[PDB]
Each structure stands twice: as C-alpha cells, then as structure tokens.
Amino acid sequence: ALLSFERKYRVPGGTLVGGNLFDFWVGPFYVGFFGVATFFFAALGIILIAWSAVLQGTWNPQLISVYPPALEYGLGGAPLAKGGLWQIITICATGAFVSWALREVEICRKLGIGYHIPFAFAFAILAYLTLVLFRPVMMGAWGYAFPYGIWTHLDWVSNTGYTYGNFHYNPAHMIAISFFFTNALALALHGALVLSAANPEKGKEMRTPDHEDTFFRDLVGYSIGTLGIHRLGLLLSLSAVFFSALCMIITGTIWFDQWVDWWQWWVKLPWWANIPGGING
C-alpha cells in the first residue's frame, strides 16, 4: 500500500478541521475531513443522478441527462422532476469540488509543500461556477446553465454558441483559445525537451539543463529555462481558463447580440469609418 519511500512522510498533522479524527489513509488515498466531505457530496450527487435517470427511463450513461429548471422558474427552486435534482446536484457538485481542493490543501500541509495545486484547481472550479452559478444568476435563470449529460452538454454548447452567430467572434473567446493552443505547444515542447535530454542518442550520456537552453537558443534565439517553463505552463493554462470564464460571464449579460457585430466599433471609428474601398467601404 506504500511506495518504497512513503512511510517517512505519513506522519500526523496538517489537518485544518477535526485535528486527529480523520487523519489517516485508505489504501493510497489520504482521507481527512474533506475526504469525508467530498465522499458525502459525491455519493449524494451520484444517487440524485441515479434517481434522475430512473425518472427519465434510461440507465445508459450516453443518454442520461439532468436539465436545469426551465427559464420561467427564474432563480427560484423547481420541482425535483423538472430542475430540482439539478439544483441539488449542482450544490453537491460544488460541495465535492471545493472539499477536494481543501483536501489537497491538507495534503500540502502534511507534506510541507506550496499550495499551488489547489490554487490552480480553484480556477477550474471557478469556470464551472461561472457556467452554472454566476452567469445564470446574472441572467435571472438556472435554465441558462448547461445540463449534465455527455452529449446534451455539447448540445448546450452548440446552441448557446449559435445564439450569438459564430462564437468565434467573441474576443475574449479568441484570447482563451490562443492560450489553450499555446499551452499545448508548450506542453509538447517541454515534455520533448526534458525527454530528449534524459534520453539522448544511443550510447551517449544524459545531457544537462545547459543542453536544454543551448538547444532552444540555437533553435529560436531564446530559452526561458526550467523554472520559467513551469511558471509558463501554469500561466498559459490558468489564463486559458481565466479567459474562458471571462468570455462567458459577459455573454448573455453585457453582450447578447451577434458577436461578429461587436467588431463594428473598430471599423466605424470616425477617422477611417467612411473612407471608400477595402472590405467595409
């Protein structure tokens, strides 16, 4: 049940709540109060979802979907059959994600590391909450949230998108994308570099972080370095998600027309607005 170097770290302490009560593992998993919290919220989330399936008629996870309350409900509560379960499951979901994060913080404390991980996760949780809590509330109804089902959530995406034309024109959505693509470029390169040094040509000796800078400088004129690249991946990722949140929190709220049209501010600026020729003259 333990990695060969593990026991020296399995010492008491680091917990935020209930002191020694839940300070222990089950197999490889640390528990803690937040272990108990996430399990409770998770189980109740899944039982509500399982019960929701029965009301729908399927047990096929490719067909099961839980829809928010219809928009007439506004921000009120709904009947379980028609948005209630979702409303409760969302509370169990948020419960389980946030308990998972504070559990990670407890893991951090015991291990004496920085809290960067739970911090990072908090951004994912914030993107989730934007879609199901902040935007729906600013919009006056839970109906605007996405439904919990494998394909039906993709529907909500396509539908939500094409409410505003080609969503490509949302400018925050362009920033987010660029960060997602850039992150993935950076992930490929970073993996491949370290691997290319740890796994040199047959018979040769492992290279060195000097080789890693040398290679990249040779190649593009700059090397960010090994602290840098991990600051970078973290930043690209969190930015990608920061801007995903941003590009939906404004959609439906401050902007609700066709996004292509937002770009008219630019084309119509009075110093070139009426000049003939080009695509807009």
């Binding site: 990695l3 170097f5 770290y9 197999g27 490889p28 998993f29 640390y30 559990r103 990670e104 015991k110 590391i113 960067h116 990072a120 994912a124 995406v157 396509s158 693509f181 992150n183 993935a184 470029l185 992930l187 490929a188 970073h190 993996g191 491949a192 570099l193 691997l195 290319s196 040094a197 740890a198 796994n199 040199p200 040509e201 290279r207 290679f215 400088r217 040779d218 190649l219 593009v220 004129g221 700059y222 090994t226 602290l227 991990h230 600051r231 973290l234 930043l235 690209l236 990722s237 990608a240 998600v241 630019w266 084309v267 600026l269 000049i275 003939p276 020729g277 080009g278 695509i279 807009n280």
Partner: protein, 302 residues
C-alpha cells in the same frame, strides 16, 4: 506573505552563456543579444545566441516570402490606402483557387494563384523548420523527441492544406489566409459536415486539448510547490531522486491513488499534447472523404 515563486525576487547575471558545443558548428551561432530585466522576473533574461545556418536562412526567407505574399494581397485589397488597411486588417483574405480549377495551377494570380504561391512558400518554411528541429538535436547528441512531436502538429497542418484538398480533387477545400476568413472556414467546415461535435476524433482532440491544460496546470503547480527542494531541476531528480520528487509523487497518490516519476510525467506530457493534433488530423482527413455527415455516420457508424 509566503513567497510563491511565480516571480523571482532577486536577479543575478553572469557572463553571457554562449552554451554547449558538442557537434555544433560554432561558425553559425550568432552572438548573444541583449539581456532583458523584464523577462528575468519570469524566466531567463538572456537572448541569444541563435544558430542561423542554411535551413535557418532557408525557412526564414520563405516564412517572410509567405507573409509578404499575403500582405501585398491585403494592401492591394485596401486599394493601397493605409487607413483602410489598418481598418479592414481582419476582413481581408487571400483565398485559394475556385473549385473549377481542381488541383491544377491553371488559375490567375488573383483568384487563386497568389494563394498557391504563398502556400508553396509556407510548405518549404515549415518542412525546413522541421529539419532544423532534428539537426539541432543531433548536433548536441540529444533525442529527436522535439522533432517527433513537432511532426504531430505538422500532420494536422498538412492534412488541412495539402493532403485533404488532394484527396477531394480541389485546392478550394484548403484554408484561406485571413484572420476572420479562416474562422469562417472553420465554422463552415463543421456545418457542411454534419457538425463536428459528432466526429469521435474531434471530441478526442478536445479531451487532449482540455487535458493538456489540466496537465500542465497540474505539473507546473506541482513543480512550483516542490521548488523549495530543487524540483525544477528535473534532470538531476531523474538521475538521483530527492525529496522534491517524492513529495510530488505522494501529493498525487494521496490525492488520486496513483502518481508519476520525474521522468515519466514528461512522457504523459508529451503524449497528451501530441494527441491533440494527431487524433485531430484524422478527424479532418476522414471528413468529406469517407464521411460526409458526422451526425449521419454517428447514427449507424457506417
């Protein structure tokens, strides 16, 4: 408060690092360029040297040749007026030849020829850049991972512009050179193909792209969390595991019940990313060639 190691507090500079020399022809490295205090808060402050060479000179010349072919066409679309040029910069587009010209080069400079010229240039630019990715590694005696992984990105690019238009018997299936036009091409491609959300490869691509963000968020954060035990120093933690590698492995196994090595996290990393464009280019290449409607295909899968 407690320092997080997202920015450096103190910067330190020595003599310019001109770098290692293994089989590298030094006659072709530039000199070091300026140092940047700004960059030094985050990564390295040194710029250069770059290794120009024949493939460097080759790629860069074509790169620019491609970029000016499009920009000349834009300037022309602006009727030579720089007001209009700034103004409509994303509405301009260098569009491939019409369907009627198939895979020929029969068509005027305007109306397709300029697109082809610019594409040819892009082709030599990228492939030569690719070879430079391999050769630079070999010179230092390092692995060809960067080249194998860059190839996966090349795949998707090749598929969109070259393999798929060839397999559909026409260049007009290829992507135009414009900021807004190429987004329109994207949206139109999905509409004309039954909605790509129904392409299983397209969804796989998304899981890897979302997963790339998840993973690099995870990894970077983890390495910053264990930077107080020398974590960034990953190649020495491979050669000689330290408590940084152990604390990291155990954060994750106590969190989700399994973990990685300081070497193997980078195999997860390179693969997660590389499978974005891999699966992605399959999905595109199959579209209009084998499957005309992803919805339809989904219904039976035949």
């Amino acid at each position: 408060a407690e320092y997080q190691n997202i920015f450096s507090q103190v910067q330190v500079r020595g003599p310019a690092d001109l770098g290692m020399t293994e089989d590298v022809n030094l006659a072709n490295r530039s000199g070091v360029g300026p140092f940047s205090t700004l960059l030094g808060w985050f990564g390295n402050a040194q710029l250069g040297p770059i290794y120009l060479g024949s493939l460097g000179v080759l790629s860069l010349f074509s790169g620019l040749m491609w970029f000016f072919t499009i920009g000349i066409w834009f300037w022309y679309q602006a009727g030579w007026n720089p007001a209009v040029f700034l103004r409509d910069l994303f509405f301009f587009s260098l569009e491939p030849p019409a369907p009627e010209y198939g895979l020929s080069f029969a068509a005027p400079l305007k109306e397709g020829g300029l697109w082809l010229i610019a594409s040819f240039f892009m082709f030599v630019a990228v492939w030569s850049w690719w070879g430079r990715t391999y050769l630079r590694a070999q010179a230092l005696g390092m692995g060809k991972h960067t080249a194998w992984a860059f190839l996966s990105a090349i795949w998707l690019w090749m598929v969109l512009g070259f393999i798929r238009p060839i397999l559909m018997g026409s260049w007009s299936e290829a992507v135009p050179y414009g900021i807004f036009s190429h987004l329109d091409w994207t949206n139109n491609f999905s509409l004309v193909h039954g909605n790509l959300f129904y392409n299983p490869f397209h969804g796989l691509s998304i899981a890897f792209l979302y997963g790339s963000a998840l993973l690099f968020a995870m990894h970077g954060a983890t390495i910053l969390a264990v930077s107080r035990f020398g974590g960034e120093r990953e190649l020495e933690q491979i050669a000689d595991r330290g408590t940084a590698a152990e604390r990291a492995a155990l954060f994750w196994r106590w969190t989700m019940g399994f973990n990685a090595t300081m070497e193997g996290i980078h195999r997860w990393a390179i693969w997660m990313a590389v499978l974005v464009t891999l699966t992605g280019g399959i999905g595109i290449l199959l579209s209009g060639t084998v499957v005309d409607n992803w919805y339809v295909w989904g219904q039976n899968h035949g």
